[PDB]
Amino acid sequence: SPALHRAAAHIHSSPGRSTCLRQTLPLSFVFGPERSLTQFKEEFRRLHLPGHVLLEDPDSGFFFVAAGCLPDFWLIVRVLQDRVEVYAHARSLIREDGGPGTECRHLQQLLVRRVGEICREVNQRLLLQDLHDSHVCNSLLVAESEEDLWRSGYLAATMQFVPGHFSCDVVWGTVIRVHSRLKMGPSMGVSRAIQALRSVLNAFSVVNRKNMFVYQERATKAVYYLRLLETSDRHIQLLVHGVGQAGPEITDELVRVLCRRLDEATLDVITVMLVRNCKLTPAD
């Protein structure tokens, strides 16, 4: 503890020096620091460094980077209430001729990137948990579209780092062929396949967003946003957006359930047609 404290004091008391570097990284906590601090600490503890291991001192609370024995350079990371301080000490941090300064700078940059990614992931997880617990899609979690707008402590998040544009991209995408009987539903312009999918997914569909559902995987505890669209040969195109790659619960089981519902609807329609002894199409 006292050696790390002295190194941090020397780094802070020598700004702009070629041997000591101090960097401050803010933690954009959408839900506040009370819940974000524990998540950030856990992520930092579970964070992995290339060729280095982070040891957290319990007396001081500041993590130190060591070779995985102390290396030729000292890297110290301090986690405050709402900011992260990274201190790097080396003989020459400016020279990059295969020395310890270049390695220390690369390690500091990697640690800063990992901390930023961890903060973003914590914010996304908090937003997903709030959406799952409230069945409402926040603007920061996903931007409100024109259809959603027509059918419609986060103030700092709105007046902070750009929200809405940080929504997770479509992790997986699939196209499901729609049968000829289900191509036209009971309402003009509404496919029967779309209606069946809505009826199936009403258990997790978003009220404020049309044809949108929020599904939380049981294994990964990750809430993902599913969007379904009709593509014309009418078909159902489903895009699943999540922080990480979609698991097998949504990739396979959900597709199987949707296919089973579509097949049941087609079989019921065919039975109704045969009840009237109507001519059956070769596709039917």
PDB file of C-alpha atoms in Angstrom:
ATOM      1  CA  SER A   1       0.000   0.000   0.000  1.00  0.00           C
ATOM      2  CA  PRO A   2       2.554   2.744   0.872  1.00  0.00           C
ATOM      3  CA  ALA A   3       4.737   2.063  -2.182  1.00  0.00           C
ATOM      4  CA  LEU A   4       1.701   2.304  -4.468  1.00  0.00           C
ATOM      5  CA  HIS A   5       0.542   5.453  -2.666  1.00  0.00           C
ATOM      6  CA  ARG A   6       3.972   7.062  -3.079  1.00  0.00           C
ATOM      7  CA  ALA A   7       4.064   6.125  -6.769  1.00  0.00           C
ATOM      8  CA  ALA A   8       0.583   7.579  -7.304  1.00  0.00           C
ATOM      9  CA  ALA A   9       1.530  10.778  -5.466  1.00  0.00           C
ATOM     10  CA  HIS A  10       4.699  11.137  -7.550  1.00  0.00           C
ATOM     11  CA  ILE A  11       2.735  10.579 -10.769  1.00  0.00           C
ATOM     12  CA  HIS A  12       0.078  13.112  -9.750  1.00  0.00           C
ATOM     13  CA  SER A  13       2.687  15.653  -8.605  1.00  0.00           C
ATOM     14  CA  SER A  14       4.597  15.393 -11.923  1.00  0.00           C
ATOM     15  CA  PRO A  15       2.156  16.229 -14.733  1.00  0.00           C
ATOM     16  CA  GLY A  16       3.523  16.163 -18.260  1.00  0.00           C
ATOM     17  CA  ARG A  17       6.717  14.353 -17.260  1.00  0.00           C
ATOM     18  CA  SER A  18       8.142  11.829 -19.712  1.00  0.00           C
ATOM     19  CA  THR A  19       8.498   9.266 -16.895  1.00  0.00           C
ATOM     20  CA  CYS A  20       5.095   9.586 -15.172  1.00  0.00           C
ATOM     21  CA  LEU A  21       1.700   9.578 -16.894  1.00  0.00           C
ATOM     22  CA  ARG A  22      -1.688  10.148 -15.251  1.00  0.00           C
ATOM     23  CA  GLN A  23      -4.989   9.617 -17.072  1.00  0.00           C
ATOM     24  CA  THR A  24      -8.549  10.177 -15.849  1.00  0.00           C
ATOM     25  CA  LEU A  25     -11.413   8.170 -17.358  1.00  0.00           C
ATOM     26  CA  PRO A  26     -15.029   8.994 -16.418  1.00  0.00           C
ATOM     27  CA  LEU A  27     -17.616   6.291 -15.760  1.00  0.00           C
ATOM     28  CA  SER A  28     -20.831   7.239 -17.584  1.00  0.00           C
ATOM     29  CA  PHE A  29     -23.186   5.607 -15.087  1.00  0.00           C
ATOM     30  CA  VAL A  30     -26.711   5.797 -16.502  1.00  0.00           C
ATOM     31  CA  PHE A  31     -28.258   4.284 -13.356  1.00  0.00           C
ATOM     32  CA  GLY A  32     -25.907   6.164 -11.027  1.00  0.00           C
ATOM     33  CA  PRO A  33     -22.647   5.196  -9.331  1.00  0.00           C
ATOM     34  CA  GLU A  34     -24.280   3.150  -6.553  1.00  0.00           C
ATOM     35  CA  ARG A  35     -25.037   0.232  -8.884  1.00  0.00           C
ATOM     36  CA  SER A  36     -22.335   0.927 -11.482  1.00  0.00           C
ATOM     37  CA  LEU A  37     -19.401   0.924  -9.040  1.00  0.00           C
ATOM     38  CA  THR A  38     -19.796  -2.725  -8.020  1.00  0.00           C
ATOM     39  CA  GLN A  39     -20.211  -3.824 -11.642  1.00  0.00           C
ATOM     40  CA  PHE A  40     -17.131  -1.854 -12.709  1.00  0.00           C
ATOM     41  CA  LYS A  41     -15.078  -3.308  -9.849  1.00  0.00           C
ATOM     42  CA  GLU A  42     -16.188  -6.847 -10.720  1.00  0.00           C
ATOM     43  CA  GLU A  43     -15.384  -6.309 -14.405  1.00  0.00           C
ATOM     44  CA  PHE A  44     -11.949  -4.900 -13.551  1.00  0.00           C
ATOM     45  CA  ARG A  45     -11.252  -7.870 -11.273  1.00  0.00           C
ATOM     46  CA  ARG A  46     -12.338 -10.239 -14.056  1.00  0.00           C
ATOM     47  CA  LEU A  47     -10.568  -8.137 -16.702  1.00  0.00           C
ATOM     48  CA  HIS A  48      -7.599  -9.857 -18.343  1.00  0.00           C
ATOM     49  CA  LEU A  49      -4.411  -8.085 -19.414  1.00  0.00           C
ATOM     50  CA  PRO A  50      -2.008  -9.351 -22.119  1.00  0.00           C
ATOM     51  CA  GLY A  51       1.071 -10.562 -20.272  1.00  0.00           C
ATOM     52  CA  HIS A  52       0.045  -8.807 -17.048  1.00  0.00           C
ATOM     53  CA  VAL A  53      -2.051  -9.676 -13.999  1.00  0.00           C
ATOM     54  CA  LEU A  54      -3.964  -7.097 -11.956  1.00  0.00           C
ATOM     55  CA  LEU A  55      -3.735  -7.457  -8.169  1.00  0.00           C
ATOM     56  CA  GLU A  56      -6.102  -5.384  -6.024  1.00  0.00           C
ATOM     57  CA  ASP A  57      -4.720  -4.130  -2.717  1.00  0.00           C
ATOM     58  CA  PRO A  58      -7.401  -4.437  -0.001  1.00  0.00           C
ATOM     59  CA  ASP A  59      -5.899  -1.743   2.224  1.00  0.00           C
ATOM     60  CA  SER A  60      -5.738   0.949  -0.478  1.00  0.00           C
ATOM     61  CA  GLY A  61      -8.242  -0.275  -3.076  1.00  0.00           C
ATOM     62  CA  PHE A  62      -5.892   0.511  -5.980  1.00  0.00           C
ATOM     63  CA  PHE A  63      -5.031  -2.203  -8.497  1.00  0.00           C
ATOM     64  CA  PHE A  64      -1.435  -2.724  -9.620  1.00  0.00           C
ATOM     65  CA  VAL A  65      -0.271  -4.396 -12.832  1.00  0.00           C
ATOM     66  CA  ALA A  66       2.355  -7.123 -12.456  1.00  0.00           C
ATOM     67  CA  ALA A  67       3.954  -9.593 -14.840  1.00  0.00           C
ATOM     68  CA  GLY A  68       2.227 -12.965 -15.027  1.00  0.00           C
ATOM     69  CA  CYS A  69       6.752 -10.319 -10.159  1.00  0.00           C
ATOM     70  CA  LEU A  70       6.754  -6.568 -10.709  1.00  0.00           C
ATOM     71  CA  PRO A  71       7.786  -5.497 -14.237  1.00  0.00           C
ATOM     72  CA  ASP A  72      10.175  -2.727 -15.279  1.00  0.00           C
ATOM     73  CA  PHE A  73       7.208  -0.313 -15.231  1.00  0.00           C
ATOM     74  CA  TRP A  74       4.519   0.271 -12.604  1.00  0.00           C
ATOM     75  CA  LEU A  75       0.873   0.623 -13.657  1.00  0.00           C
ATOM     76  CA  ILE A  76      -1.667   1.669 -11.019  1.00  0.00           C
ATOM     77  CA  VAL A  77      -5.432   1.890 -11.542  1.00  0.00           C
ATOM     78  CA  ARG A  78      -7.582   3.694  -8.963  1.00  0.00           C
ATOM     79  CA  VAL A  79     -11.387   3.516  -9.004  1.00  0.00           C
ATOM     80  CA  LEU A  80     -13.121   6.564  -7.527  1.00  0.00           C
ATOM     81  CA  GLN A  81     -16.850   7.148  -7.018  1.00  0.00           C
ATOM     82  CA  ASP A  82     -17.354   8.292 -10.621  1.00  0.00           C
ATOM     83  CA  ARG A  83     -13.878   8.319 -12.221  1.00  0.00           C
ATOM     84  CA  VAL A  84     -10.961   5.987 -12.932  1.00  0.00           C
ATOM     85  CA  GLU A  85      -7.335   7.099 -12.575  1.00  0.00           C
ATOM     86  CA  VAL A  86      -4.589   5.191 -14.404  1.00  0.00           C
ATOM     87  CA  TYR A  87      -1.001   5.925 -13.361  1.00  0.00           C
ATOM     88  CA  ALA A  88       1.977   4.634 -15.354  1.00  0.00           C
ATOM     89  CA  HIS A  89       5.572   4.970 -14.144  1.00  0.00           C
ATOM     90  CA  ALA A  90       8.556   3.984 -16.282  1.00  0.00           C
ATOM     91  CA  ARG A  91      12.133   5.003 -17.005  1.00  0.00           C
ATOM     92  CA  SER A  92      11.160   6.428 -20.413  1.00  0.00           C
ATOM     93  CA  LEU A  93       7.508   6.311 -21.492  1.00  0.00           C
ATOM     94  CA  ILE A  94       8.127   8.364 -24.654  1.00  0.00           C
ATOM     95  CA  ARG A  95      10.655   6.109 -26.398  1.00  0.00           C
ATOM     96  CA  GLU A  96       9.135   3.164 -28.275  1.00  0.00           C
ATOM     97  CA  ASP A  97      12.288   1.328 -29.415  1.00  0.00           C
ATOM     98  CA  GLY A  98      11.201  -2.011 -27.968  1.00  0.00           C
ATOM     99  CA  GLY A  99      11.616  -0.838 -24.388  1.00  0.00           C
ATOM    100  CA  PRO A 100       9.417  -0.883 -21.287  1.00  0.00           C
ATOM    101  CA  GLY A 101       7.863   2.519 -21.999  1.00  0.00           C
ATOM    102  CA  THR A 102       6.126   1.368 -25.178  1.00  0.00           C
ATOM    103  CA  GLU A 103       4.841  -1.766 -23.440  1.00  0.00           C
ATOM    104  CA  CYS A 104       3.576   0.320 -20.514  1.00  0.00           C
ATOM    105  CA  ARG A 105       1.817   2.739 -22.876  1.00  0.00           C
ATOM    106  CA  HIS A 106       0.195  -0.141 -24.769  1.00  0.00           C
ATOM    107  CA  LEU A 107      -0.927  -1.740 -21.498  1.00  0.00           C
ATOM    108  CA  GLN A 108      -2.384   1.566 -20.288  1.00  0.00           C
ATOM    109  CA  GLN A 109      -4.261   2.050 -23.568  1.00  0.00           C
ATOM    110  CA  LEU A 110      -5.611  -1.508 -23.401  1.00  0.00           C
ATOM    111  CA  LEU A 111      -6.698  -0.986 -19.786  1.00  0.00           C
ATOM    112  CA  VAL A 112      -8.456   2.275 -20.688  1.00  0.00           C
ATOM    113  CA  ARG A 113     -10.254   0.585 -23.587  1.00  0.00           C
ATOM    114  CA  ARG A 114     -11.261  -2.323 -21.339  1.00  0.00           C
ATOM    115  CA  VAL A 115     -12.557   0.066 -18.666  1.00  0.00           C
ATOM    116  CA  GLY A 116     -14.604   1.988 -21.227  1.00  0.00           C
ATOM    117  CA  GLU A 117     -16.010  -1.230 -22.677  1.00  0.00           C
ATOM    118  CA  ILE A 118     -16.846  -2.461 -19.167  1.00  0.00           C
ATOM    119  CA  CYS A 119     -18.664   0.788 -18.363  1.00  0.00           C
ATOM    120  CA  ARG A 120     -20.626   0.595 -21.623  1.00  0.00           C
ATOM    121  CA  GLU A 121     -21.509  -3.056 -20.974  1.00  0.00           C
ATOM    122  CA  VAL A 122     -22.620  -2.251 -17.416  1.00  0.00           C
ATOM    123  CA  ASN A 123     -24.846   0.553 -18.708  1.00  0.00           C
ATOM    124  CA  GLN A 124     -26.317  -1.740 -21.376  1.00  0.00           C
ATOM    125  CA  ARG A 125     -26.945  -4.497 -18.819  1.00  0.00           C
ATOM    126  CA  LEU A 126     -28.650  -2.035 -16.466  1.00  0.00           C
ATOM    127  CA  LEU A 127     -30.840  -0.775 -19.317  1.00  0.00           C
ATOM    128  CA  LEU A 128     -31.729  -4.345 -20.315  1.00  0.00           C
ATOM    129  CA  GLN A 129     -32.588  -5.244 -16.713  1.00  0.00           C
ATOM    130  CA  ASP A 130     -34.782  -2.148 -16.396  1.00  0.00           C
ATOM    131  CA  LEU A 131     -36.535  -3.002 -19.669  1.00  0.00           C
ATOM    132  CA  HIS A 132     -37.113  -6.595 -18.540  1.00  0.00           C
ATOM    133  CA  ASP A 133     -38.460  -5.481 -15.152  1.00  0.00           C
ATOM    134  CA  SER A 134     -40.676  -2.756 -16.663  1.00  0.00           C
ATOM    135  CA  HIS A 135     -41.542  -4.161 -20.135  1.00  0.00           C
ATOM    136  CA  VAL A 136     -40.604  -0.743 -21.566  1.00  0.00           C
ATOM    137  CA  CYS A 137     -37.779  -0.013 -24.011  1.00  0.00           C
ATOM    138  CA  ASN A 138     -35.773   3.024 -22.930  1.00  0.00           C
ATOM    139  CA  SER A 139     -34.566   5.601 -25.441  1.00  0.00           C
ATOM    140  CA  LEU A 140     -30.937   5.003 -24.446  1.00  0.00           C
ATOM    141  CA  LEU A 141     -31.349   1.236 -24.848  1.00  0.00           C
ATOM    142  CA  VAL A 142     -32.954   1.669 -28.284  1.00  0.00           C
ATOM    143  CA  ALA A 143     -33.920   4.735 -30.292  1.00  0.00           C
ATOM    144  CA  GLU A 144     -37.616   5.453 -30.782  1.00  0.00           C
ATOM    145  CA  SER A 145     -38.617   4.992 -34.419  1.00  0.00           C
ATOM    146  CA  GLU A 146     -41.269   6.935 -36.318  1.00  0.00           C
ATOM    147  CA  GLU A 147     -43.875   4.215 -35.750  1.00  0.00           C
ATOM    148  CA  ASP A 148     -42.983   4.010 -32.054  1.00  0.00           C
ATOM    149  CA  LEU A 149     -43.118   7.806 -31.725  1.00  0.00           C
ATOM    150  CA  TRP A 150     -46.537   7.843 -33.407  1.00  0.00           C
ATOM    151  CA  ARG A 151     -47.741   5.046 -31.097  1.00  0.00           C
ATOM    152  CA  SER A 152     -46.122   6.593 -27.999  1.00  0.00           C
ATOM    153  CA  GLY A 153     -32.004   9.236 -12.732  1.00  0.00           C
ATOM    154  CA  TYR A 154     -31.773   8.955 -16.514  1.00  0.00           C
ATOM    155  CA  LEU A 155     -31.810  12.729 -17.098  1.00  0.00           C
ATOM    156  CA  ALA A 156     -28.006  12.817 -16.927  1.00  0.00           C
ATOM    157  CA  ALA A 157     -27.870   9.896 -19.367  1.00  0.00           C
ATOM    158  CA  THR A 158     -29.964  11.920 -21.820  1.00  0.00           C
ATOM    159  CA  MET A 159     -27.767  14.987 -21.216  1.00  0.00           C
ATOM    160  CA  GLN A 160     -24.583  12.896 -21.340  1.00  0.00           C
ATOM    161  CA  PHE A 161     -22.785  10.602 -23.803  1.00  0.00           C
ATOM    162  CA  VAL A 162     -24.896  10.120 -26.939  1.00  0.00           C
ATOM    163  CA  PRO A 163     -27.824   7.786 -26.158  1.00  0.00           C
ATOM    164  CA  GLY A 164     -29.967   5.953 -28.665  1.00  0.00           C
ATOM    165  CA  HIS A 165     -27.066   5.640 -31.093  1.00  0.00           C
ATOM    166  CA  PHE A 166     -25.421   3.120 -28.733  1.00  0.00           C
ATOM    167  CA  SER A 167     -28.157   0.519 -29.266  1.00  0.00           C
ATOM    168  CA  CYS A 168     -26.860  -2.993 -29.874  1.00  0.00           C
ATOM    169  CA  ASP A 169     -26.758  -4.144 -33.487  1.00  0.00           C
ATOM    170  CA  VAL A 170     -28.686  -7.156 -34.773  1.00  0.00           C
ATOM    171  CA  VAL A 171     -26.723 -10.089 -33.345  1.00  0.00           C
ATOM    172  CA  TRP A 172     -28.587 -12.610 -35.511  1.00  0.00           C
ATOM    173  CA  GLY A 173     -30.880 -12.390 -38.515  1.00  0.00           C
ATOM    174  CA  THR A 174     -33.156 -14.947 -40.164  1.00  0.00           C
ATOM    175  CA  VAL A 175     -35.771 -15.059 -42.924  1.00  0.00           C
ATOM    176  CA  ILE A 176     -38.806 -17.352 -42.643  1.00  0.00           C
ATOM    177  CA  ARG A 177     -40.850 -18.178 -45.732  1.00  0.00           C
ATOM    178  CA  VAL A 178     -44.577 -17.439 -45.455  1.00  0.00           C
ATOM    179  CA  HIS A 179     -47.122 -19.873 -46.874  1.00  0.00           C
ATOM    180  CA  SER A 180     -49.489 -18.826 -49.649  1.00  0.00           C
ATOM    181  CA  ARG A 181     -52.546 -19.241 -47.412  1.00  0.00           C
ATOM    182  CA  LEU A 182     -50.987 -17.098 -44.667  1.00  0.00           C
ATOM    183  CA  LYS A 183     -49.615 -14.495 -47.103  1.00  0.00           C
ATOM    184  CA  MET A 184     -52.794 -12.412 -46.722  1.00  0.00           C
ATOM    185  CA  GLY A 185     -54.310 -12.167 -43.259  1.00  0.00           C
ATOM    186  CA  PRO A 186     -57.796 -11.123 -42.154  1.00  0.00           C
ATOM    187  CA  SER A 187     -56.691  -7.467 -42.361  1.00  0.00           C
ATOM    188  CA  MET A 188     -55.462  -5.966 -45.624  1.00  0.00           C
ATOM    189  CA  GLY A 189     -51.727  -5.320 -45.463  1.00  0.00           C
ATOM    190  CA  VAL A 190     -51.300  -7.502 -42.356  1.00  0.00           C
ATOM    191  CA  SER A 191     -49.813 -10.912 -43.092  1.00  0.00           C
ATOM    192  CA  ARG A 192     -51.359 -13.851 -41.259  1.00  0.00           C
ATOM    193  CA  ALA A 193     -47.819 -14.977 -40.425  1.00  0.00           C
ATOM    194  CA  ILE A 194     -47.196 -11.573 -38.832  1.00  0.00           C
ATOM    195  CA  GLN A 195     -50.399 -11.888 -36.795  1.00  0.00           C
ATOM    196  CA  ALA A 196     -49.447 -15.400 -35.663  1.00  0.00           C
ATOM    197  CA  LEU A 197     -45.965 -14.221 -34.673  1.00  0.00           C
ATOM    198  CA  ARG A 198     -47.497 -11.332 -32.719  1.00  0.00           C
ATOM    199  CA  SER A 199     -49.891 -13.699 -30.940  1.00  0.00           C
ATOM    200  CA  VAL A 200     -47.006 -16.032 -30.078  1.00  0.00           C
ATOM    201  CA  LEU A 201     -44.677 -13.246 -28.894  1.00  0.00           C
ATOM    202  CA  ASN A 202     -47.288 -11.212 -26.987  1.00  0.00           C
ATOM    203  CA  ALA A 203     -45.811 -12.736 -23.814  1.00  0.00           C
ATOM    204  CA  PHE A 204     -42.736 -10.533 -24.359  1.00  0.00           C
ATOM    205  CA  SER A 205     -43.785  -8.028 -27.048  1.00  0.00           C
ATOM    206  CA  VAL A 206     -43.152  -4.326 -26.462  1.00  0.00           C
ATOM    207  CA  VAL A 207     -46.331  -2.261 -26.210  1.00  0.00           C
ATOM    208  CA  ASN A 208     -44.646   1.043 -27.095  1.00  0.00           C
ATOM    209  CA  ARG A 209     -42.783  -0.409 -30.111  1.00  0.00           C
ATOM    210  CA  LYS A 210     -44.765  -2.099 -32.872  1.00  0.00           C
ATOM    211  CA  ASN A 211     -43.607  -5.599 -33.867  1.00  0.00           C
ATOM    212  CA  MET A 212     -40.853  -5.442 -31.231  1.00  0.00           C
ATOM    213  CA  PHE A 213     -40.247  -7.814 -28.329  1.00  0.00           C
ATOM    214  CA  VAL A 214     -37.734  -7.998 -25.484  1.00  0.00           C
ATOM    215  CA  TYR A 215     -36.534 -11.517 -24.659  1.00  0.00           C
ATOM    216  CA  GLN A 216     -34.140 -12.263 -21.798  1.00  0.00           C
ATOM    217  CA  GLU A 217     -32.117 -15.453 -22.181  1.00  0.00           C
ATOM    218  CA  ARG A 218     -32.205 -17.668 -19.103  1.00  0.00           C
ATOM    219  CA  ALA A 219     -28.646 -18.995 -19.410  1.00  0.00           C
ATOM    220  CA  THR A 220     -26.896 -15.713 -20.253  1.00  0.00           C
ATOM    221  CA  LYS A 221     -29.298 -13.372 -18.380  1.00  0.00           C
ATOM    222  CA  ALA A 222     -29.168 -11.071 -21.425  1.00  0.00           C
ATOM    223  CA  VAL A 223     -32.235  -9.198 -22.692  1.00  0.00           C
ATOM    224  CA  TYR A 224     -32.376  -8.826 -26.475  1.00  0.00           C
ATOM    225  CA  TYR A 225     -34.682  -6.831 -28.741  1.00  0.00           C
ATOM    226  CA  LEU A 226     -36.367  -8.752 -31.569  1.00  0.00           C
ATOM    227  CA  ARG A 227     -37.794  -6.905 -34.581  1.00  0.00           C
ATOM    228  CA  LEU A 228     -39.969  -8.620 -37.193  1.00  0.00           C
ATOM    229  CA  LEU A 229     -40.666  -7.255 -40.673  1.00  0.00           C
ATOM    230  CA  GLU A 230     -42.551  -8.478 -43.737  1.00  0.00           C
ATOM    231  CA  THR A 231     -40.372  -8.800 -46.847  1.00  0.00           C
ATOM    232  CA  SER A 232     -41.895  -9.204 -50.307  1.00  0.00           C
ATOM    233  CA  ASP A 233     -42.848 -13.825 -52.120  1.00  0.00           C
ATOM    234  CA  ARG A 234     -44.003 -12.597 -48.718  1.00  0.00           C
ATOM    235  CA  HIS A 235     -41.817 -13.679 -45.808  1.00  0.00           C
ATOM    236  CA  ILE A 236     -41.111 -12.867 -42.162  1.00  0.00           C
ATOM    237  CA  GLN A 237     -37.678 -11.377 -41.451  1.00  0.00           C
ATOM    238  CA  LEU A 238     -36.658 -11.318 -37.778  1.00  0.00           C
ATOM    239  CA  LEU A 239     -33.651  -9.363 -36.488  1.00  0.00           C
ATOM    240  CA  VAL A 240     -32.422 -10.064 -32.948  1.00  0.00           C
ATOM    241  CA  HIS A 241     -30.297  -7.323 -31.378  1.00  0.00           C
ATOM    242  CA  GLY A 242     -28.211  -7.979 -28.277  1.00  0.00           C
ATOM    243  CA  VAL A 243     -24.968  -6.967 -26.616  1.00  0.00           C
ATOM    244  CA  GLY A 244     -23.374 -10.326 -27.428  1.00  0.00           C
ATOM    245  CA  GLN A 245     -23.977 -13.222 -29.773  1.00  0.00           C
ATOM    246  CA  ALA A 246     -27.416 -14.779 -29.419  1.00  0.00           C
ATOM    247  CA  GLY A 247     -27.523 -18.066 -27.547  1.00  0.00           C
ATOM    248  CA  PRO A 248     -29.166 -21.315 -28.599  1.00  0.00           C
ATOM    249  CA  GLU A 249     -32.382 -20.505 -26.710  1.00  0.00           C
ATOM    250  CA  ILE A 250     -33.267 -17.686 -29.131  1.00  0.00           C
ATOM    251  CA  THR A 251     -31.431 -18.987 -32.198  1.00  0.00           C
ATOM    252  CA  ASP A 252     -33.186 -22.379 -32.272  1.00  0.00           C
ATOM    253  CA  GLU A 253     -36.040 -22.723 -29.765  1.00  0.00           C
ATOM    254  CA  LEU A 254     -37.729 -19.434 -30.698  1.00  0.00           C
ATOM    255  CA  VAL A 255     -37.446 -20.200 -34.421  1.00  0.00           C
ATOM    256  CA  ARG A 256     -38.870 -23.675 -33.799  1.00  0.00           C
ATOM    257  CA  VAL A 257     -41.797 -22.215 -31.840  1.00  0.00           C
ATOM    258  CA  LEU A 258     -42.528 -19.668 -34.577  1.00  0.00           C
ATOM    259  CA  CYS A 259     -42.372 -22.380 -37.249  1.00  0.00           C
ATOM    260  CA  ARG A 260     -44.699 -24.592 -35.199  1.00  0.00           C
ATOM    261  CA  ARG A 261     -47.194 -21.739 -34.818  1.00  0.00           C
ATOM    262  CA  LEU A 262     -47.070 -21.006 -38.555  1.00  0.00           C
ATOM    263  CA  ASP A 263     -47.550 -24.698 -39.368  1.00  0.00           C
ATOM    264  CA  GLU A 264     -50.512 -24.907 -36.982  1.00  0.00           C
ATOM    265  CA  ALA A 265     -52.110 -21.868 -38.625  1.00  0.00           C
ATOM    266  CA  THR A 266     -51.545 -23.342 -42.094  1.00  0.00           C
ATOM    267  CA  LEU A 267     -53.011 -26.698 -41.040  1.00  0.00           C
ATOM    268  CA  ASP A 268     -56.075 -25.004 -39.544  1.00  0.00           C
ATOM    269  CA  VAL A 269     -56.567 -22.978 -42.736  1.00  0.00           C
ATOM    270  CA  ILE A 270     -56.220 -26.107 -44.883  1.00  0.00           C
ATOM    271  CA  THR A 271     -58.716 -27.968 -42.688  1.00  0.00           C
ATOM    272  CA  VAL A 272     -61.175 -25.072 -42.971  1.00  0.00           C
ATOM    273  CA  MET A 273     -60.776 -25.057 -46.759  1.00  0.00           C
ATOM    274  CA  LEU A 274     -61.281 -28.827 -46.975  1.00  0.00           C
ATOM    275  CA  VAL A 275     -64.391 -28.519 -44.790  1.00  0.00           C
ATOM    276  CA  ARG A 276     -65.882 -26.603 -47.727  1.00  0.00           C
ATOM    277  CA  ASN A 277     -64.339 -29.174 -50.118  1.00  0.00           C
ATOM    278  CA  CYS A 278     -62.409 -26.335 -51.743  1.00  0.00           C
ATOM    279  CA  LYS A 279     -59.750 -27.126 -54.321  1.00  0.00           C
ATOM    280  CA  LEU A 280     -56.290 -27.524 -52.797  1.00  0.00           C
ATOM    281  CA  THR A 281     -53.278 -25.809 -54.321  1.00  0.00           C
ATOM    282  CA  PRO A 282     -50.211 -27.941 -55.141  1.00  0.00           C
ATOM    283  CA  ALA A 283     -48.331 -25.948 -52.506  1.00  0.00           C
ATOM    284  CA  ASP A 284     -51.154 -26.692 -50.065  1.00  0.00           C
TER     285      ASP A 284
END
